[PDB]
Amino acid sequence: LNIKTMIPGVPQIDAESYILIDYNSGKVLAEQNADVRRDPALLAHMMTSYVIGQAMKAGKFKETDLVTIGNDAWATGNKGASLMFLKPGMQVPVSQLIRGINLQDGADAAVAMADFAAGSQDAFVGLMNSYVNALGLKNTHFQTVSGGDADGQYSSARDMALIGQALIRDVPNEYSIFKEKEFTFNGIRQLNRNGLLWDNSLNVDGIMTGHTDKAGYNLVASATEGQMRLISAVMGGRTFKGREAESKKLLTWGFRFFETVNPLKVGKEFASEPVWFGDSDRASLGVDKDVYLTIPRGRMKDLKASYVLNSSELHAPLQKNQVVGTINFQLDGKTIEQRPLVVLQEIPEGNF
């Protein structure tokens, strides 16, 4: 009812679905049909990139390793021109192939990497589906690594934003690939088709874009402003003209009306409480995971922190990171965010 306590209107987005989330807090800022199962088109390669990134993180291979191209990679919609051939017998560096997945149809480079990383396309696809389970995605399923007609291949705006968040969070060295405006594939210079990388009003460093007639226009974008990072997923975009415009509009809106606060870090003492029957007198209390809250912009000065304990008194023995209560964060008297209150240091039984 104030200009201070206002609820912002969401801009009109000419697309079938969308979601906008904060990367750190995972807070959902805006959504429409975010769980509707859709053709992801070329965004499916975000999951391809994710699995590849996990393989490299785990030291399975390196960007300098040479990959031989098979007949499997050649058979994808079968050189009559195109110096963009991944022809059989070639041995391409992993560096070229992981970037070539992002480029044009990633089909032949994705098929080559699938065999390299997982032995076969089917096994690799099994890995994409195990990570759908690991990431908790409820509306994503993969059928193929090449391109994406595939009638049993789908995702949603939310699930695609979550894949973008995991890419950034879990495999940042693979995520770095996405901001490169240009790279050389097979000796020929390519440009990044994420045009928002050239936007000087926004700091966008990801992620992927893809259009087909059945899937419409699709973009997953990530943008930063200081320490704040937003992720948008816009899918089933209706027009060419809005294919980057709609996502820009969403991203700028989330930065204008929301700010992400970090009230408390792992290991820092939020409160202390006395503990009975221990070797020590007081329990050091806080969190086991960094607290990130996304709140209305202008409100961070007004945010109030408090806590409640699971009990009347703390009794030893207390394990490190044992949950003993709840931290509540309030604005205007109402609790908007809660986190678990843990023991920061073990208090074994004793005397006291």
Shortest distance in whole angstroms from residue 139 CB to Cl ion? 21
**Contact between 25 and Cl ion (CB under 5 A)?**
no
Among 9, 59, 89, 152, binds Na ion (CB under 5 A): 59
Shortest distance in whole angstroms from residue 33 CB to Cl ion? 30
Axis-axis angle for helices 121-134, 107-118 (nearest 10) = 80
Which stretch, 5-13, 15-23, 55-63, 111-119, contacts Na ion (CB under 5 A)?
A: 55-63
What contacts 40, CB < 8 A, 6 or more positions away? 148, 153, 154, 155, 160, 210, 215, 218, 235
Q: Give the Å distances, CA to CA, from 190 to 70, 74, 348.
A: 23, 20, 61
- DSSP for 32-49, please give it: ESTT--B--GGGGHHHHH
Q: Which does 56 bind (CB under 5 to 8 A by kind): Na ion, Cl ion, none?
A: Na ion
Buried b (16+ CB within 10 A) or exposed e, 250-286: bbbbbbebbbbbebbeeeeebbebebebbebeebbbb
Q: Which does 54 bind (CB under 5 to 8 A by kind): Cl ion, Na ion, none?
A: Cl ion
Cβ closer to Na ion: 60 or 256?
60
Cβ closer to Cl ion: 54 or 232?
54
**Contact between 54 and Cl ion (CB under 5 A)?**
yes
Cβ closer to Na ion: 105 or 174?
174
Shortest distance in whole angstroms from residue 170 CB to Cl ion? 7
What is the total count of residues that contact Na ion (CB under 5 A)?
3
Q: How many CA atoms lie within 13 A of 250 on its CB side?
A: 35
Among 34, 43, 56, 167, binds Na ion (CB under 5 A): 56
Site for Cl ion, rule CB under 5 A? 54
Which positions touch Na ion (CB under 5 A)? Answer: 56, 59, 62
